[model samples]
Target: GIVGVGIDLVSIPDFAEQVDQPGTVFAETFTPGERRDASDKSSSAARHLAARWAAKEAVIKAWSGSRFAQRPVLPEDIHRDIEVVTDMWGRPRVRLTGAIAEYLADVTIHVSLTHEGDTAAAVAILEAP
Candidate 1:
């Protein structure tokens, strides 16, 4: 069963400079793994980070009316709860932790991420059995 769906777009050029800043914006919004992956390859860090950001936004949107809607979870809390990672073949996998994981224990999350020049986009889907 499908629970919810969401899509989001991010302008890489608009947030490129901020991505390099080692401040609250980056530290608070992105997980440690995301930050490290972005840092590991400086050439495409901004674009990759932007795509991850979009994925996170999309995931939250998809969860809006699902299990997380009434959980008193804020955007910042969501940020802390979710982490987007890519497999060897470049498929996005979303990892959840803490209360969010417990809430979605019977659910599955699917995510797709893409980037084109100065733009990045993502789509997220939530499924339940």
Candidate 2:
């Protein structure tokens, strides 16, 4: 059954500059697996991160859209703990972790990502059996 849907976009240029700053924001927001998938070896590394970032927010939005019941419990960082995990085929899904994982166990999130020029976009759908 469908729960909710969400979509988010990012400016590759702005995101690129955001990550270049000297701080742990990039580290705080992204996980090790995400970094490996968007390795710096690629010239468009920041774009990849931007798409991943978009996916994170999209997942949160999708979760928020599921206001069919009581108040939804979210992770402390909101963006940090929710991860975008991709496979060998580059297929993406929202990986719940820490405090939010137990709360979202009944939901499955499907995600897709794409980029053109300086913009990257992502969409997420929430489902439950």
Candidate 3:
């Protein structure tokens, strides 16, 4: 059954600034595949990162709306728990990881991402087994 749904948005310039700032937050927030997808050489990396950020947030929001919201779903170095990934067909999707993955083992998440004009948006729909 449908468990929860969420939506989020990000500003490309704001995300670019955050990523540019010196800190480990960047490494912790995004997975290696995401960085590679939004390579430093690409001027559009900021926009891509913005979309990824929104995607992650959307997942979090959905998880928060779920019955397991109180299970420390995103607590303590948990930003990496959710990842944005691409399939063989080049479609974007959410990848859950770490203890959270095991915790929500039977859950399925559907995600969609879009970006334009300095803004990025993502939506997530969650279903439980």
Candidate 4:
């Protein structure tokens, strides 16, 4: 049950710069688990983190841009707006805020992340009314 699809790409280095910052910008944007998930893996750990971030961004665009022909949702909620987690095989997935779910009951999401040559790409598909 998907109503929209979105995609985005990011540079890992760009996100690492954000990590250098201290405050809600980082904390609100990333969950403790997401930070830990990117820990001690590979150079691409940063890229993977970026990919997750991009996925959330893409979904926000889709939601706000009316791809689903729905009402407005703001990216200001980026931190509180989305939740991401990895599967057993290290595949990442997206979860919407409860507020969004209460409104878009039929909504569902799909995400994919990839890293290559210092770039990471994330794609998301959302289904709703």
Residue by residue across 1-129, what tens digits does model 2's lDDT show? 989899999887767655544444567776555554454434566667888788887888887778632454434455566788567677776776775676678877788998888888999998888
User: Candidate 1 on 1-129: residue-level lDDT in tens?
Assistant: 989898999887766655555765568667666565565333477777888889888988898857578767665666678777777787788888867778888888888999987788999999987
Shift of residue 29 alpha carbon in model 1, Å: 5.2
Q: Which stretches of candidate 1 lie over 4 Å from their true place?
A: 21-25, 29-42
Off by over 4 Å in 2: 22-25, 31-42, 68-75
User: Tens-digit lDDT track for model 3 on 19-97?
Assistant: 6444445667765555554544235766777777788888888878888688754465456676786565747877777
Ranking by TM-score: 3, 1, 2, 4
Model 3 TM-score is 0.80
RMSD values, in order shown? 3.2, 3.7, 3.2, 3.5
Report, for every candidate in turn, its global Cα lDDT versus the true structure.
0.77, 0.72, 0.74, 0.65
Query: Which whole-number lDDT from 0 to 100 does residue 91 have in model 3?
Result: 70
lDDT of 3 at 116: 86
TM-score per candidate, chains pooled: 0.80, 0.77, 0.80, 0.73
The residue pairs that clash in candidate 4, if any, are: 2-127, 3-127
**Candidate 1, pairs of clashing residues:** none
Model 2 deviation from native, Cα RMSD in Å: 3.7
At residue 75, candidate 4 shows an lDDT of 42
